[PDB]
Structure formats: C-alpha cells, structure tokens
Design a protein around this ligand. Structure first.
Ligand SMILES: CC(=O)N[C@@H]1[C@@H](O)[C@H](O)[C@@H](CO)O[C@H]1O
Ligand SMILES: *[C@@H]1O[C@H](CO)[C@@H](O)[C@H](O)[C@H]1NC(C)=O
Ligand SMILES: *[C@@H]1O[C@H](CO)[C@@H](O)[C@H](O)[C@H]1NC(C)=O
Ligand SMILES: [Ca+2]
Ligand SMILES: [Ca+2]
Length: 405
C-alpha cells in the first residue's frame, strides 16, 4: 500500500461517512498552493523556500508515497500562489510584489532560473501579502491574480486604482518576450471591495468565476462588539471570463460586510443572513441602503472567522471543495476543516443566499478547543487526473490525499 507510514501528531481529522484520507508528506516548511505537473509530480509552493516537486508512487486509492523531493525554484520571497500552464511548460509563482513565469522542462523536471520573466508587477502592500494565481481552464491564456488589503480596515480599498482588495485578469498570450510585465491595475477587474479573497476558482459547468473571502476582524455594529459570530465569510460570484455580466463590481469592503448571525445584531431592520450592511467605519454618507444598492452581496455566507483559503470544483461542477484555515479572532475556534458546497446545472449553489447550512463537512477537527496548536490548517487544494483531492496544511507542514472510499 505505502512505502512509509506517516502519522499525524495531533487528534486526527475526522472524515465524513464515505470519505477517507492519508497523510502523504511531512516536514514541509509552509505548504500553500499545490498543483500536479504533466509527469505526475506534485508541485508545492513551500512558502519561504520556493516551488518543490514531490515524486509520488501510486498504488491506488489513498495508497500514495513520496519517494523523492526536489527544489525546482529556490526563492524565499514566494509566499502562496502557484499555477501551471495547460501544456505543462510554464510555471507561474508570485511574491508580494510580482507574478513570475518560468520555463519548466518536463523532460528533465528542472527550471532554468534564467528563463524567469515578470508578467505582473507593483502588487506590494503590508498585512495581506499573498497573491493567489488561477489559470483559467475555459480560457487557458487568462491568468487571475488576487490581492488583499494593507490593513484590517484599509481606506485605500475605497480607491480602485490602489489595486488593494481586488481580483484582476491578465491575457498572458498578449505578452511578448521584449515587452515588460503588466501593472497590477492594467488587468481586467474581476471584482474589488474584496478584503482578502485568497481562494479563487472556475466552475467547469459554465466557466463561472468564484472567490472565498476572509472578512473583517473585530467587527462593531452601532459601537457594540458583535465580532464573535459576524461578519460571515463569503462565497462571491464574478460572472464568466470574456464577458462583463456580474463582473467588476465592488463586493463591499471596507464600507459593507455580510450578515451571518442575526441574533442580538443592533438595528437588524429587514436584514437577512447574506445581506450586507454598512460598517461602523464606513465613509461618511454610506448607510445600510447604500450597501444594498451600490455593492454586490455574496452568493453564500459561512460561519464568521472560518478563514477560507481555496475553492476547487469537481470535473462535473456539482461540488466545490473549500479549505477553512481556522479562526484566530474568535473565543471558541471555528474552521480547521475541508467542506463541500453543492452546485446546480446553472452553475450556482443549490443553497439559497440566506442558508446557514450550505457548507457540508468533509474532514473536520475532532475538538475545536485544541485549535490551532493541535489541529491541521488546510490551505491549498488540487485534483489529480482521476478525481482524488490533495490538500496542504501550512502550519503542520503536511500534504494529504482525500477521496471517497
Ligand atoms: C452529473 C454527474 O455526472 N454526476 C456526478 C456525481 O454523481 C458524482 O458524485 C460527482 C463525482 O464523481 O461527479 C458528477
Ligand atoms: C509600476 O509602478 C510604477 C509607479 O507607479 C510605474 O511608473 C511603473 O511603470 C509600473 N510598472 C509597470 C510595468 O507598469
Ligand atoms: C471600527 O473602527 C474602530 C476604531 O478603529 C475599531 O475599534 C472597530 O473594531 C472597527 N469596527 C469594525 C471593524 O467593524
Ligand atoms: Ca477575518
Ligand atoms: Ca462582501
């Protein structure tokens, strides 16, 4: 079954009925985004090291072993994002300021450092420093890049030209060898008002673009501290690449936040779960009505502070898997899990926007009071060619495989 028998060092994750998993790699520095190359190797963005390639021996199901590891790219500035071209010959990886493209030699499984070129630049800011990369499947030359806020409440997120808290799309086919990288704000605007939407994914049913949001910390409502269960994390819809419908809007940060818990909420009015409301620190003139009329509400909301970091859809588009990295801004911890959300034939969640039960648990921490110290912190997801799910846990240095049994 496996060459080595890696065991977790904390109360082990609990698999929902029908699911099984196995720990397949340990001792990584800080694994973030992951993706398979064309030769069946697993590329890992190990933050603070670079891009590592894990050689896997596959005996079927969860019976996988790492037999070797190689550092393809050594660059301590790479901190999260990673993508590979459809043809398998170009690796993309980002620092806080730039998105780099490297030529990957699939024959030798090596990257010549001198082939590196910058494709997007000027992304640097403090606080939220990850630059998530997604290459479209439907439009394989379209690269999306996510960029969060410079503070918990960043005023410059009100200025679209600042580049803060937004998702941009770049046609990489239009980029000559001679010409320089795009400026971050030169890309197509997928959305702004997105505090730190680290997770971005493409639904194969119709090509819909989806993002998951890490919402504001230490929320007050009419001065009252309501942060324990507000605001909700969010699933945001950005329409479809190569069209403008439902795309480019302002998702509300930092003037509007989405409602998770209605109990004890000051001035609830006619607000429902999922509706956005004005922040106590909203710019002068913004009210709850402004949030309803001028800003884009989330398609779904999730328990406050779960901190989602990735969203990946299955081949069918019937299910999206999301990593909940775990709370730091709540008294009892929440998250520390992998959940699924069901999607219908029109490419939308089957749950309504006021659902509090749309996230279905797949892998959960047995005892949330032990998190984060004794729990996994899921970050990146990726599917192999046969539908098995692989995910990283950055805090624990692990890679796991997950499948139905
Ligand atoms: C519409 C369709 O083909 N349905 C399947 C569904 O039964 C299955 O659970 C999922 C994962 O294989 O992929 C899809
Ligand atoms: C990056 O930003 C600087 C300062 O605004 C700008 O002058 C420079 O041209 C930008 N780089 C690119 C390639 O746009
Ligand atoms: C609003 O700003 C105040 C003062 O900076 C802060 O204490 C409070 O947490 C903020 N409320 C939010 C983020 O909802
Ligand atoms: Ca948060
Ligand atoms: Ca929002």
């Amino acid at each position: 079954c496996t060459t080595n028998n890696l065991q977790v060092t904390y109360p082990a994750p609990v698999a929902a009925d029908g699911w099984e998993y196995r720990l397949i790699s340990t001792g990584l520095t800080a694994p973030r985004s992951i993706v398979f190359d064309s030769t069946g190797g697993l590329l890992v963005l190990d933050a603070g090291v670079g891009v590592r390639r894990l050689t896997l021996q596959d005996n079927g199901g969860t019976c996988l072993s790492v037999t070797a590891n190689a550092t393809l790219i050594a660059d301590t500035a790479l901190n999260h994002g990673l993508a590979i071209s459809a043809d398998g010959g170009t690796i993309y990886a980002s620092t806080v300021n730039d998105v780099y493209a490297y030529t990957y030699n699939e024959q030798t499984n090596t990257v010549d450092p001198t082939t590196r070129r910058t494709v997007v630049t000027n992304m640097t800011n403090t606080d939220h420093v990850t630059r998530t990369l997604l290459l479209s499947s439907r439009l394989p030359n379209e690269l999306l890049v996510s960029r969060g806020s410079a503070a918990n409440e960043d005023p410059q997120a009100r200025n679209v030209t600042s580049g803060h808290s937004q998702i941009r799309a770049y046609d990489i086919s239009t980029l000559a060898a001679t010409d320089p990288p795009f400026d971050f704000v030169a890309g197509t605007l997928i959305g702004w008002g997105l505090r730190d939407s680290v997770g971005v994914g493409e639904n194969p049913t119709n090509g819909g673009i989806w993002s998951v949001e890490n919402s504001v910390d230490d929320l007050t409502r009419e001065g009252v501290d309501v942060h324990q269960d507000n605001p909700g994390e969010e699933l945001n819809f950005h329409g479809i690449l190569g069209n403008t419908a439902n795309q480019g809007g302002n998702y509300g940060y930092p003037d509007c936040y989405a409602l998770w818990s209605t109990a004890g909420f000051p001035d609830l009015g006619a607000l429902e779960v999922g509706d956005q409301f004005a922040s106590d620190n909203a710019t002068a003139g913004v009210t709850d009505a402004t949030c309803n009329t001028n800003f884009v509400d989330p398609r779904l909301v999730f328990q406050a502070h779960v901190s989602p970091l990735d969203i990946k859809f299955n081949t069918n588009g019937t299910t999206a898997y999301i990593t909940f990295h775990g709370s730091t801004d709540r008294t009892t911890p929440v998250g520390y899990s992998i959940v699924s959300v069901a999607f219908g034939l029109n490419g939308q969640p089957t749950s309504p926007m006021d659902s509090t039960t749309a996230a279905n648990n797949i892998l959960t921490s047995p005892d949330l009071t032990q998190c984060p110290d004794d729990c996994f912190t899921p970050v990146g997801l990726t599917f192999d060619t046969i539908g098995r799910l692989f995910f990283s846990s950055d805090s624990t240095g692990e890679i796991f495989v997950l499948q139905q049994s």
